[PDB]
Amino acid sequence: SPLDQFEIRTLFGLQSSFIDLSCLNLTTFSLYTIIVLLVITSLYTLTNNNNKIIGSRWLISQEAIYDTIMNMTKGQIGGKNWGLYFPMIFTLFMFIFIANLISMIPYSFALSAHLVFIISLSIVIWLGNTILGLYKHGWVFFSLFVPAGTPLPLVPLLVIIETLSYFARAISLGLRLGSNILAGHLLMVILAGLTFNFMLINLFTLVFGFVPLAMILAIMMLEFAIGIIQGYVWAILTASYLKDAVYLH
Template identity: 55%
Template sequence: MIYSPLEQFEIKPLLIINNYLTLSLTNYTLYLIIVATIIISYIAIISNVTLKGSRWSVAIVSLYDTMHNLVISQIGRTGGTFFPLIFTIFNFIFVANLISMIPYSFAISAQIVPIVSFSISLWIGNVILGLYLHHWGFFALFVPSGTPLLLVPVLVLIEALSFSSRAISLGLRLSANILSGHLLMLILGSLILNLMSSSILGFVGGIIPIIAVVAITILEVGIAIIQAYVFSILLSSYIKDSVSLH
């Protein structure tokens, strides 16, 4: 049981087995398993869709089609190769963000170190992809066409810094938005609780702020979905740069 709202951001061990090896199951690992189980259920539903599918299966197929169109529009005809990666990452972030909105749950996306490490690994993969496809020609990405020779060193430095910042900004944007939204609801909820427990007048006056908190909660659910979509769009655009060099 969580005794403090801030515990949704703390990684705690749930099970520790000491033998020849130490096996530790944390709440972070538990929620990763939950998210992976839900995603596997997605795949099972898609693979069993028939012409007489249910509304749930139609929603899943619509999500599949939306992400497919996104990848093709961002990357181009070769985007189908990277669609399984983008679709899996979108579902992972999408499910993790929605689960974090459940009271007394754990916010995976708010963990800055794992999410930023994940974005760095994707960035390294993009660099390896670009070097594999274009070899040394990949570095032409840092020199825009038609650049005067005198400005090349300056532009190369600026483009290199901009390209390198993607490694951190991709995951930092996601974790910062989720963390700030949860902290906002935590602060407002704590203030309303203190107000309503102070007196009868405070209890009556706290009804209106509760409506605002409910509206903010609905907004945070929308932001949780949008952040997964934005992460997928940015990752697709970064892959496009590695594939097409523009």
């Protein structure tokens, strides 16, 4: 069982017999959400030395993240009011960016590799695009489903397999991230499990047994890239989707 690293264990506990209060209780998932919140709080509270203008070396990091997500959501929705949807496009980044660096620490735990939470967050953003689009643009919201000047005898086919791609968008956006984080962690644990039993046979294998160690180091080098790039790709697709929902093509 190489997948035991994702087990959810209850720690602080709470129960009753009147009402099902077992929904909220401090758990491994919940404790790592508390840790994510305290890290994100720590990146801005004690980072700023006594509210100085000059912005010490720690604040350049949270300066660059801010600027690379402003200049990304200005180039996507880019209309009359792009900044009204900027806090959500930033707080969808920082959760995924911090929750995929915390998960790299060896005896730790991936928030992002729970499909039930990430798929739920994706369905929340998809319904919050459809409701916002219907509210802002009435019955002509469905004009999104015809591409451009197209010949009329093939328009209903191009409507059906446009709407099918419109509600595949509900689960695709989440399952991309879930699949990347889950496959990366499962790859690292399985190769560690193979190189461990590689190094317990006869003593000639601990000699020149440095090359599988170097391969695992190279995969860990790759895994930060595949963890930060997904945190960026989430925040670019849910900027493009707000471009479609707010502005009709």
